[PDB]
Amino acid sequence: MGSSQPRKKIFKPEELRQALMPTLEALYRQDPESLPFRQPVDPQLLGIPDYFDIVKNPMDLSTIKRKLDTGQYQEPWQYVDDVWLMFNNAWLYNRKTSRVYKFCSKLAEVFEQEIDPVMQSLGYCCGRKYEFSPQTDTLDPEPFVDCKECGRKMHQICVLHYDIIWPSGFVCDNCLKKTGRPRKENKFSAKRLQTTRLGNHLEDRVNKFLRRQNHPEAGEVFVRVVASSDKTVEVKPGMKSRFVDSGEMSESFPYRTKALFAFEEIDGVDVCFFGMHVQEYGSDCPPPNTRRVYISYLDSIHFFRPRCLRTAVYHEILIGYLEYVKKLGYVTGHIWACPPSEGDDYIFHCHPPDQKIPKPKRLQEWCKKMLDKAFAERIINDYKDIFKQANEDRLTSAKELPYFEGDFWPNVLEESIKEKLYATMEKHKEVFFVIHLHPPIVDPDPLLSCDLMDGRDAFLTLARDKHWEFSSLRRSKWSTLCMLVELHTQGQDRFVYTCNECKHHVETRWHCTVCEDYDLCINHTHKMVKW
Ligand SMILES: *O[P@@](=O)(OCC(C)(C)[C@@H](O)C(=O)NCCC(=O)NCCS)OP(=O)(O)OC[C@H]1O[C@@H](n2cnc3c(N)ncnc32)[C@H](O)[C@@H]1OP(=O)(O)O
Ligand SMILES: [Zn+2]
Ligand SMILES: [Zn+2]
Numbered sequence: 001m002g003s004s005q006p007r008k009k010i011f012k013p014e015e016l017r018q019a020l021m022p023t024l025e026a027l028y029r030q031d032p033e034s035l036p037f038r039q040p041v042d043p044q045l046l047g048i049p050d051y052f053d054i055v056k057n058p059m060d061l062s063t064i065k066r067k068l069d070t071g072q073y074q075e076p077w078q079y080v081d082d083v084w085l086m087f088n089n090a091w092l093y094n095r096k097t098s099r100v101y102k103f104c105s106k107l108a109e110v111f112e113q114e115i116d117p118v119m120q121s122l123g124y125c126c127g128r129k130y131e132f133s134p135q136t137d138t139l140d141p142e143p144f145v146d147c148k149e150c151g152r153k154m155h156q157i158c159v160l161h162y163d164i165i166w167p168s169g170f171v172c173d174n175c176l177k178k179t180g181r182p183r184k185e186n187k188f189s190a191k192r193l194q195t196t197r198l199g200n201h202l203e204d205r206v207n208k209f210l211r212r213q214n215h216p217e218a219g220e221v222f223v224r225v226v227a228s229s230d231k232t233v234e235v236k237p238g239m240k241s242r243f244v245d246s247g248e249m250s251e252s253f254p255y256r257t258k259a260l261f262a263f264e265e266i267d268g269v270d271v272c273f274f275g276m277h278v279q280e281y282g283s284d285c286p287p288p289n290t291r292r293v294y295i296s297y298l299d300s301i302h303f304f305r306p307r308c309l310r311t312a313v314y315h316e317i318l319i320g321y322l323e324y325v326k327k328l329g330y331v332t333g334h335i336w337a338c339p340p341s342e343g344d345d346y347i348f349h350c351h352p353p354d355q356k357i358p359k360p361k362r363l364q365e366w367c368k369k370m371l372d373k374a375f376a377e378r379i380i381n382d383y384k385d386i387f388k389q390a391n392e393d394r395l396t397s398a399k400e401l402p403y404f405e406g407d408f409w410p411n412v413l414e415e416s417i418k419e420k421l422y423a424t425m426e427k428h429k430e431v432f433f434v435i436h437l438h439p440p441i442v443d444p445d446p447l448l449s450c451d452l453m454d455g456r457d458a459f460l461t462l463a464r465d466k467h468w469e470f471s472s473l474r475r476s477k478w479s480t481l482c483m484l485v486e487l488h489t490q491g492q493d494r495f496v497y498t499c500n501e502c503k504h505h506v507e508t509r510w511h512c513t514v515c516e517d518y519d520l521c522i523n524h525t526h527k528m529v530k531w
């Protein structure tokens with residue numbers, strides 16, 4: 001085994017102890033909570049032959065005070081590792097209700113407040129031990145990066161370092177203050193994801209809205225369509241032989257699906273807080289799907305700042321989507337207000353343990369207020385539930401109900417092969433919404449090929465394998481960081497550049513510093529730079 005780091009930071013025993021032990025003392029000062037932890041657990045005093053079969057690496061205050069007085073701690077992380085070992089043993093062996101388990105959780109909250117500022121004055125990120133949430137006995141550990149100058153190990157998520165963005169490796173912020181050099185800018189930002197008129201309309205509408213409240217904690221919101229492609233939904237086998245072969249419905253229906261995300265600036269970095277896939281059935285689509293939009297999936301992570309504006313901003317995006325597609329020529333929109341089953345995440349891979357999953361009544365009230373806001377603001381003319389809408393229009397055939405990919409109704413009808421259906425319809429009236437917005441539809445936006453966002457499964461899968469959780473602010477920041485690198489570097493679109501004036505292909509060009517995407521053939525009112 002070969003090794004080397006010449007200007008590494010090494011701590012002499014007295015330095016660590018003088019810094020670290022004021023934290024070990026705050027644990028001892030907890031009475032009675034520290035008392036079962038001041039000496040090694042003795043199973044023969046306590047009556048637990050169990051213990052050493054269950055706890056393989058015992059640890060306690062006295063042992064830590066010994067190592068800290070002997071100098072057995074080379075780096076500060078070895079000290080912190082040993083206290084969390086102490087806490088983790090107790091949390092493990094004892095049941096979550098026991099006294100000692102609660103003693104431990106008091107000691108741990110005390111350690112957490114004490115160790116963070118200390119480790120940061122010693123030049124580290126924090127003094128926590130982090131593990132990722134459980135997957136399908138052991139848990140996977142958060143990752144570390146070493147500063148190429150210090151050698152001091154840091155949490156990659158704490159410092160938000162990624163070699164793809166900064167390929168010359170991780171250099172700590174303090175070593176950069178002596179370095180003279182600041183960190184170089186992350187060019188893989190949300191703002192810098194390719195813009196679109198759909199994306200632009202949504203973010204432009206929300207930011208003036210956030211402005212009208214003018215809360216000081218709020219940051220900028222970026223809305224980006226990150227995928228678009230042309231698909232078809234195949235009629236399932238039962239309804240197929242009963243209606244397509246007869247020629248009453250088309251065998252497949254074309255639609256354009258789009259995946260879009262919103263990001264907020266929080267602590268000067270991008271945080272993804274909202275995501276949605278939609279299906280858009282244009283004006284050349286045969287009945288019953290002609291000129292319809294459907295919200296396939298809507299997902300969210302509650303870290304928008306401030307909390308008191310979070311939902312209002314979700315409504316603004318949704319309300320904004322309807323205004324946009326109405327303008328392009330769509331006539332009706334549809335929402336299936338269904339809360340996720342089990343602990344299944346629609347779009348984001350690990351929601352906060354304490355983000356409430358709403359009751360369907362809550363979910364339906366939510367949409368109810370959402371649509372009402374749009375009617376009032378003169379964007380929606382009206383909206384009804386499927387029954388008041390379906391037979392107010394007097395549908396009597398199953399083929400007159402819109403037929404959308406992955407929607408409930410194609411499979412209620414598909415099982416109904418052997419077998420009443422109007423009764424199946426009446427049971428769930430409230431969860432299924434029909435939204436009334438009111439010359440071909442022309443999407444002015446180009447297609448974005450992005451397999452990662454081609455439907456909701458690809459991003460869920462990649463985030464589970466790579467542990468991009470959205471379970472905390474710090475993890476969402478990291479997951480967003482990497483999500484954005486994936487969109488920037490592994491999308492599947494290649495870019496041809498054309499001069500906005502001469503329709504010609506350009507390589508060398510003058511690009512406008514102000515305009516959305518403006519280039520001129522070398523052969524204009526704005527300052528231009530050569531690219
Ligand atoms: O914060 P919200 O606007 O979020 C709405 C969302 C639909 C975006 C959200 O629930 C989400 O991300 N859902 C993902 C999957 C899904 O359901 N998709 C369906 C698309 S139609 O408002 P909420 O409704 O989430 O919550 C607002 C407050 O209500 C509390 N709350 C929610 N669920 C609760 C349950 N089961 N029990 C009790 N309270 C519940 C939340 O805590 C929120 O209260 P605060 O005071 O803000 O904490
Ligand atoms: Zn850390
Ligand atoms: Zn450093």
Ligand SMILES: [Zn+2]
Nearest residue numbers: 512515518526
């Ligand atoms: Zn210009």
Ligand SMILES: [Zn+2]
Nearest residue numbers: 499502504521
């Ligand atoms: Zn030109």
